[PDB]
Design a protein around this nucleic acid. Structure first.
Lengths: 140, 42, 354, 41, 355, 245, 177
RNA sequence: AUACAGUGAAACUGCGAAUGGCUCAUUAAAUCAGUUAUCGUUUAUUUGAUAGCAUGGUAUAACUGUGGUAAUUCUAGAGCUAAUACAUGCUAUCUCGACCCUUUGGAAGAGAUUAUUUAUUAGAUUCUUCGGACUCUUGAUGAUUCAUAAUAACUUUUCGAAUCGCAUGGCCUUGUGCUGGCGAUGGUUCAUUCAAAUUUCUGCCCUAUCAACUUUCGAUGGUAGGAUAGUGGCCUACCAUGGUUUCAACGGGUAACGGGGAAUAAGGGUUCGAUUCCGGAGAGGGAGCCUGAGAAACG
């Protein structure tokens, strides 16, 4: 469904003139994110409208690129990913088993499930808790 | 939701804001009750 | 400072000296680059609503640009003070006789509390606010919201007892009568309900009626008269019914004005008779007598009016509007000037010898 | 009061206007010539 | 008369079918003074962006109401102007007035009429006492100051040249905007005299590098069937001027293309009157002149439509003899030397129809 | 702090000004000007602590008000003018030109120069862009932006400019195997040959440099200032020539 | 005053913060400029930098553009018909970005009649306008969408709803009334 | 020196007064220390680029004189006059160039000729005179709806020198005709500088005689809107229930400002960290406004 809300979901400033009778009647815009990442076919030719999509929305990726594992997918277009690493602790000459859970916006183009390993990039702040946007999923 | 919920919650300052007040009735309600009865229903 | 009608002498003591189509901001810049009675009697953006304090010495008004309140004192004849709030306040009443406590239905779907010492805390209302009235024999702020709810707030409990039910999508005007302490609610679906406190029951429901063009009304005035027995309803076609207390027949049946909605009906206690003010967005305010039901006078400020009040003594009609000066009218034909502008009778002599 | 010094200042201002116009014109013309010879070569 | 509220007070009260609109008899009694104040509000110069925004406001003011307000406005404009010198004489001026004030009045007239033309493209009327008389007065006085005075008054000669060019382009615009609503035969002889004085004499050497308004006007003459009366009024003066432009080889392909468009139109348009046959034989001389062209002089649209001109020549056959058939096989070897990769199979089939 | 700061404590000065600690308590704040702040050298500390031509700030002010000390052909009159890297300071009665250039120890230093080398200047072309009427321009490091450059100039170039008028004399591209100057980093002040140029994605473009005593080290392209070609440095170096022992 | 920061909110680990400092000026929040239909009344504000930001509290005239033909004309406003913020604001006529409005049609009628000669309603291949907007032309009032921010510039410039968005919002209109 | 020119009180005007200085009550990622972004924004000044009427108006301070009053840095009446005050208003070049000509070119003609707000486009990935010719398929990053360019509109709406100092020249129809030196302030845009704003990853004192929490008044996001310089549950309208976890969350104790330091035992590392550097917060109470590039100032 492409019109699931009371506002006409469309990207800004794109205009398909009804004066020409072209076959491809819906014009879609995307962009090459680069950074050693690929623009997937479902993103570049899907029928979804997003602003926080890293490939079709108006948010660029810049800064730090992180890795995580999918824990819970029970919020729209956003997934919390879990960072697992070891801790610098001085007292007893060893590490400590620690973890960090990072809420990350996801585009609906990628297909995701619990436990997938994902690489993400920093993006400009969208909401109170989200700071990152995914750039590549990988199944496991 | 955000502020669209009516829940009967207790408020601190407004309970002692201005209450109580006067019984400024112009009548004794003994005629006004049967006046309600003898309103436009009858 | 002029006169509109011919047989009767009316007086706009403060108002735009330019009549129409030459806008007020360019007019004031032009005339300041090329006599008022109260110091700084203007807002220079707009104004919403007026309620004179019960003492008859404070004039509280709400205006729009950086939405604020002008508190004037008739003793000082200037701003007692000014105070900015967040959003454009729509409905307000001063709870006490002095201005020390004020409540206001605020357009951001909330209720706010203006005070002497400051500003007590805002409280949200679950639906969009339509009309708030203060019951003053049982301490109640009750507000008809957007649609089917009329929420209720007691000043001893602080909680909400129960929202009253009005089975329409709009709550266009609410009033309370204290001579007989009943609740009145008029809705633009040609429906008017009357409610009963101390027992929590609706007692009356009426007032389907059509105009000449067969259109539904929009009742914007649900008031009553000084006796607390006969009521007055008024809607968008310049249409004024004055009903009695318990009959289906209106006592007075009048049509006037235009398709522009009338905004306020108010009573006046003359020396021998009862009179009526209709105020309409036909930029008009007509002054009837109720026995004849006759427009004895009429005032045209040439620019629209959003609210009217009459001073409790005699003579003065405050009017809150969208213009630069909040404007007020003097009527010699009901009584003299009040105790504090006591030279306006001599200014009346001046305009008559002019 | 209108002075010959003021007329001197005014014609000096007009002279500076036409002078900077001429300088911009020569700069644009020489850049066009440079780009033309670079593109032909 | 006020300034800072102008365009919005216009779009409030003076718009018909709006609030506080002026009634019909009130329009009848107050509109002349409205014409005068809007004459001032058009006489305003657009030296700034806000000033030209108010000029675009007045150009949106004019074409809404009706015809007779604007017609009386143009008659008052001509009254500030005059044509009674040139039309109390035949084409003479008794008191020569080449003053900058006079030509400035003419230029302001040109500005206001081209503005109302551009905003009222189709529904504008042509009041005869307000367009032909002052426009030919303007361009005639332009030619008068062109030939009488020397090059000393460079201000006057420069503004005269701009006035003349604006006169050509506004005459072209009004002709292409009305088409054939009415017969111009009242002063058609006089406007054709103004046509035949400079243009057939010196049309090819001057207007050859880029397409001109005069050439577009003569294209419209050939395009619409009623505008042949100049050609049938003289001994084909504009036709031989067109032939001279075609014969000159320094003329650009973008100039010569629309000439052959008009040539296809005038060959396609039949009329059973005098001189039409000698006219189309002069267009056969134009075929003789286009014979070396199209590949050493003259563009996919161009080569397509000129080939269509050859196909139309074949289908109607207004030219038949062995002379034009040898010229046809010469044009055939030329156009078959010409390329085919940028062409369409249907156009090749039309080549086969010619063959 | 509420707004911008406008003073500079003595100990908080950059270390390579060699300002002593026991003269007062403050240090001069360099003006708003062409070059940077934290890596510059003001005229006041130039004419007092560097050249010993004056004793007090009042005498430096009297000198600059007599207008002798031209800078880049133009006359300065203010005391806290922030001279930086590759600058021209022109003393007309002491008959000297000075290229303010770096040394190996990191300290800014003078170089006595005659007019045939004062008349030009090497600037690190840093940011090329376009502007009004579609015209191109190029932004150097010293606040000098040149509209209408030669289109063969790219990002991270070196341009030699006229000083009197302001036209570009010529330009030098960024090729591996040239003579470069290192501006930042730990080992700023050395010259050698750049052997190659690796690239990162969104990171620092690190460069290896071999110096003429044939030793390798690592710098960064943000620090690299291209000076010239093999055996032909376009400016006269100070003695030491990037050989540190 | 109205603060724009976030330290008055709870944290992300189920925790409330403390007051960090007093509200500094560089995070200001002001009154929304809920513009109503009326005679044009705009206020000027001097904001950060030398910025002159204008808040229209009443506006009478808006600019609207045809995207299909590609023109633009200044025109009055009949009034709001739909806004996806709140239906009560649609009722109380709050002119806002991304709202639906009814506009008069006689200036575009004058434009089409002047440029074409064919009166709308009742170069035809260049005159084939949509049937819904031609019915709105014959009625005298067309539909449009407004998306100029009211309280950042004090202007109302939008585009006349053409086929796709016009059809979606006409379906929304018919589902509303 | 018969307009002033030297000297200069007062007053108007411009600029600054948000720098500096002082104390430690608070707060355990709140600031902070390191690192990064601004492809998420704003900046007076500096510096450098950058714009094709022989001069109009008033309205006043300063100042003279009448005053009331008990009076503060109290005012009123009456009489003057200036601006960088305030408000206003004006002034020929390029493209193709036939033709004449060869050098060096003009010469009629056809054409074009600052700031906003919206909408639409572009900016895309073989032959040899072995002596010689082409006879074919913007910049930017890791990327930007980018800079930029264009059209049509649009605006309660703009600067596009009505200034000032020294000297006084060049030409000649010797008119006071027309030019011309050095430099002080102003004005748009862009860059630079100085800053301000939010931010990415890690690092905090003790505690389970403290295992459960936000879920309302947003606590998690999305759709959409207003708010400033800008993203943003910043807040608001609809929907779902999201996240912390003994990997101790949450709050509870520090007479704890933090960072750097200093003393200290020959050693694990321990006590001030008040000092003299960098950051952080603050000066009747509370609320609301003010000017400015810059404040929630301490005025």
């Amino acid at each position: 469904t492409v019109q699931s809300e009371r506002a006409f979901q469309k990207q800004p400033h794109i205009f398909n003139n009804p004066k020409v009778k072209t076959s491809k009647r819906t014009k879609r815009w995307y962009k090459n994110a680069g950074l050693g990442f690929k623009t997937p076919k479902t993103a570049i030719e899907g029928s979804y409208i997003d602003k926080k999509c890293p490939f079709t929305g108006l948010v660029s990726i810049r800064g730090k690129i992180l890795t995580g594992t999918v824990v819970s997918t029970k919020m729209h277009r956003t997934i919390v990913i879990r960072r697992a690493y070891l801790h610098y602790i001085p007292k007893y000459n060893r590490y400590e088993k620690r973890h960090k859970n990072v809420p990350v916006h996801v585009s609906p183009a990628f297909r995701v499930q619990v436990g997938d390993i994902v690489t993400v990039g920093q993006c400009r702040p969208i909401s109170k808790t989200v700071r990152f946007n995914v750039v590549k999923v990988s199944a496991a | 939701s955000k502020g669209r919920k009516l829940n009967y919650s207790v408020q601190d300052p407004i309970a002692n804001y201005e209450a109580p007040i006067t019984s400024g009735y112009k009548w004794s309600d003994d005629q006004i009750d049967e006046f309600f009865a003898g309103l436009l229903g009858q | 400072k002029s006169t509109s009608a011919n047989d009767v002498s009316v007086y706009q003591v403060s108002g735009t000296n330019v009549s129409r189509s030459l806008p007020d901001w360019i007019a004031k810049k032009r005339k300041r680059q090329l006599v008022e009675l109260i110091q700084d009697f203007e807002f220079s953006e707009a104004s919403n609503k007026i309620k004179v304090s019960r003492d008859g010495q404070y004039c509280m008004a709400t205006g729009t640009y950086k939405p604020q309140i002008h508190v004037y004192d008739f003793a000082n004849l200037s701003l007692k003070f000014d105070r900015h709030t967040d959003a454009e306040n729509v409905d307000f009443t001063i709870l006490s006789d002095d201005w020390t406590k004020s409540v206001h239905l605020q357009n951001d779907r909330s209720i706010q509390f203006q005070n002497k010492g400051g500003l007590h805390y805002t409280t949200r209302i679950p639906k969009f606010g339509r009309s708030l009235v203060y019951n003053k024999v049982n301490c109640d702020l009750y507000v008809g919201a957007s649609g089917n709810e009329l929420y209720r707030l007691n000043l001893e409990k602080g909680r909400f007892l129960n929202p009253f039910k009005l089975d329409t999508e709009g709550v266009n005007h609410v009033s309370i009568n204290e001579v007989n302490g009943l609740l009145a609610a008029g809705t633009e679906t040609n429906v008017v309900e009357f409610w009963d406190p101390r027992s929590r029951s609706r007692v009356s429901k009426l007032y389907l009626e059509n105009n000449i063009d067969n259109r539904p009304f929009q009742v914007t005035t649900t008031s009553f008269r000084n006796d607390g027995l006969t009521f007055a309803c008024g809607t968008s076609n310049g249409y004024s019914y004055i009903y009695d207390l318990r009959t289906s027949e209106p006592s007075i049946i009048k049509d006037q004005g235009y398709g522009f909605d009338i905004k306020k009906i108010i009573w006046l206690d003359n020396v021998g008779t009862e009179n009526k003010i209709v105020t309409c967005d036909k930029r008009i305010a007509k002054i009837w007598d109720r026995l004849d039901g006759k427009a004895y006078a009429s005032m045209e400020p040439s620019v629209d009016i959003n609210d009217i009040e009459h001073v409790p003594g005699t003579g003065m009609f405050f009017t809150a509007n969208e213009s630069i000066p909040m404007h007020t009218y003097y009527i010699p034909s009901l009584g003299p000037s009040p105790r504090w502008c006591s030279f306006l009778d001599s200014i009346t002599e001046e305009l008559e010898e002019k | 009061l209108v002075t010959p010094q003021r007329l001197q200042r005014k014609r000096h201002q007009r002279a500076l206007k036409v002078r900077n116009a001429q300088a911009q014109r020569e700069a644009a013309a020489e850049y066009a010539q440079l780009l033309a010879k670079r593109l032909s070569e | 008369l006020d300034d800072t509220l102008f365009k919005d007070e216009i779009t409030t009260f003076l718009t018909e079918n709006g609030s506080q609109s002026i009634k019909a008899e009130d329009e009848k009694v107050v509109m002349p003074y409205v014409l005068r104040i809007f004459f001032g509000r058009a006489q305003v110069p657009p030296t700034s962006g806000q000033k030209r925004s108010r000029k675009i406001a007045v150009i949106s003011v004019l074409p809404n109401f009706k015809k007779p307000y604007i017609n009386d406005f143009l008659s008052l404009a001509s009254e500030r102007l005059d044509y009674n010198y040139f039309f109390g004489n035949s084409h003479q001026i008794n008191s020569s007035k080449a003053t900058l004030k006079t030509i400035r009045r003419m230029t302001g007239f040109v500005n206001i009429v081209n503005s109302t033309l551009s905003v009222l493209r189709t529904n504008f009327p042509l009041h005869t006492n307000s367009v032909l008389q002052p426009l030919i007065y303007s361009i005639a006085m332009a030619y008068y100051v062109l030939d009488t005075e020397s090059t000393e008054e460079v201000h006057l000669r420069k503004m005269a040249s701009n006035l003349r060019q604006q006169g050509l382009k506004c005459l072209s615009s009004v002709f292409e905007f009305v088409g054939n609503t009415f017969d111009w035969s009242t002063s058609m002889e006089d406007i054709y005299a103004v046509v035949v004085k400079p243009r057939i004499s010196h049309f090819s050497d001057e207007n050859l590098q880029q397409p001109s308004s005069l050439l577009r006007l003569f294209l419209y003459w050939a395009h619409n069937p009623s505008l042949y009366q100049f050609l049938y009024y003289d001994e084909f003066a504009t036709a031989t001027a067109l032939m001279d432009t075609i014969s000159n080889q320094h003329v650009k392909e973008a100039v010569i293309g629309p000439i052959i468009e008009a040539a296809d139109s005038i060959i396609r348009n039949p009329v059973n009157d005098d001189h039409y046959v000698d006219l189309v034989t002069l267009i056969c001389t134009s075929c003789l002149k286009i014979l070396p062209s199209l590949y050493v002089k003259l563009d996919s649209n161009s080569i397509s439509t000129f080939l269509n001109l050859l196909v139309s020549i074949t289908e109607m056959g207004f030219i038949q003899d062995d002379h034009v058939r040898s010229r046809l096989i010469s044009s055939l070897i030329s156009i078959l030397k010409g390329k085919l990769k940028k062409l369409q199979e249907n156009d090749t089939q039309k080549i086969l129809k010619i063959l | 702090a509420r707004g911008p700061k406008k003073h500079l404590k003595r100990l908080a000065a950059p270390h390579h000004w060699l300002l002593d600690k026991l003269s007062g308590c403050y240090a001069p704040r360099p003006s708003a000007g062409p070059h940077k702040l934290r890596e510059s050298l003001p005229l006041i500390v130039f004419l007092r602590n560097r050249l010993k031509y004056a004793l007090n700030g009042r005498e430096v002010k009297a000198i600059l008000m007599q207008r002798h000390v031209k800078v880049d052909g133009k006359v300065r009159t203010d005391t806290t003018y922030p001279a930086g890297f590759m600058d021209v300071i022109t003393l007309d009665a002491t008959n000297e030109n000075f290229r303010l250039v770096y040394d190996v120890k990191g300290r800014f230093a003078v170089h006595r120069i005659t007019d045939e080398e004062a008349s030009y200047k090497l600037g690190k072309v840093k940011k090329v862009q376009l502007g009004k009427k579609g015209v191109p321009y190029v932004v150097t490091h010293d606040g000098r932006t040149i509209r209408y450059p030669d289109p063969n100039i790219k990002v991270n170039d070196t341009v030699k400019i006229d000083l009197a008028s302001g036209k570009i004399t010529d330009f030098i591209k960024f090729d591996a195997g040239k003579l470069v100057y290192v501006t930042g980093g730990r080992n700023l002040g050395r010259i050698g040959t750049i052997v190659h140029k690796e690239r990162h994605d969104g990171g620092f473009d690190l460069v290896h440099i071999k110096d003429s005593l044939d030793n390798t080290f690592v710098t960064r392209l943000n620090n690299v200032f291209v000076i010239g070609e093999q055996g032909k440095p376009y400016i006269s170096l100070p003695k030491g020539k990037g050989i540190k022992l | 005053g109205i603060s724009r920061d976030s330290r008055h909110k709870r944290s992300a680990t189920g925790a409330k913060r403390a007051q960090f400092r007093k509200k500094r000026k560089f995070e200001l929040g002001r009154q929304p400029a809920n513009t109503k239909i009326g005679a044009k009344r705009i206020h000027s504000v001097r904001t950060r930098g030398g910025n002159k930001k204008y808040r229209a509290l009443r506006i009478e005239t808006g600019n609207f553009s045809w995207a299909s033909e590609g023109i633009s004309k200044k025109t009055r406003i009949a009034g709001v018909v739909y806004h996806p913020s709140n239906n009560e604001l649609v009722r109380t006529n709050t002119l806002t970005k991304a709202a639906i409005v009814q506009i008069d049609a006689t200036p575009f009628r004058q434009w089409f009649e002047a440029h074409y000669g064919q009166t709308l309603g009742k170069r035809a291949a260049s005159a084939k306008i949509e049937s819904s907007v031609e019915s709105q032309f014959s009625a005298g009032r067309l539909y449009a969408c407004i998306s100029s921010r009211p309280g950042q510039s004090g202007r109302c410039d939008g585009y006349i709803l053409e086929g796709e968005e016009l059809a979606f919002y006409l379906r929304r209109l018919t589902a509303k009334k």
